[PDB]
């Protein structure tokens, strides 16, 4: 569960560099969702907060095109 901490630390920064540190409420919830994941001591809670955190990035209609990111992977 080294990875799940680490994905989490980088998800927040991806959202941070998308200038949602202005976001105040969106940010605050992510900050404690990221904080609760770091403080986890099991896999489910950690994936359970992890699933919520990432919902944010996917709900931003223009934050980034996942099709074109995904199409960038194996090309």
């Amino acid at each position: 569960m080294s990875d799940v901490k680490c994905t989490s630390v980088v998800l927040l920064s991806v959202l941070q560099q998308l200038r949602v540190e202005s976001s105040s409420k969106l940010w605050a919830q992510c900050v404690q969702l990221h904080n609760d994941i770091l403080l986890a001591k099991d896999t489910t809670e950690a994936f359970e907060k992890m699933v919520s955190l990432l919902s944010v990035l996917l709900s931003m209609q223009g934050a980034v095109d996942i099709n074109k990111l995904c199409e960038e992977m194996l090309d």
Partner: protein, 116 residues
């Protein structure tokens, strides 16, 4: 932001690498659910029966995703009570059948609650 735009791609390319490799079903479901245009509209709620808005773009996704009043998403269980249409106009379950498809206002928007 131009050079920033390169370091931007490196971080969130790397992120979906570390997400494909995480190999969770919940993460991989919501990630690929979103790739064919089926994305969340609010944060996923873990709390007891809190609000969940998702966008469904076509009937294919629909009859792939909706079991009567129960819609499976995020390796979880979801209970609905609000399906509107593209022209923000509320729909009903029975009306989203295989027999009404082309007349309706896709995409549809389901509102959902965690299930006991």
């Amino acid at each position: 932001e131009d050079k920033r735009a390169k370091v931007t791609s490196a971080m969130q390319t790397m992120l979906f690498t570390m997400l494909r490799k995480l190999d969770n079903d919940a993460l991989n479901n919501i990630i690929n659910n979103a790739r064919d245009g089926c994305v969340p509209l609010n944060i996923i709620p873990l709390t007891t029966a809190a609000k969940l808005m998702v966008v469904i773009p076509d009937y294919n996704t629909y009859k792939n995703t909706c079991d009567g009043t129960t819609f499976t998403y995020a390796s979880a269980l979801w209970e609905i009570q609000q399906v509107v249409d593209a022209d923000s106009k509320i729909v009903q379950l029975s009306e989203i059948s295989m027999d009404n498809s082309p007349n309706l206002a896709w995409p549809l928007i389901v509102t959902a609650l965690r299930a006991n």
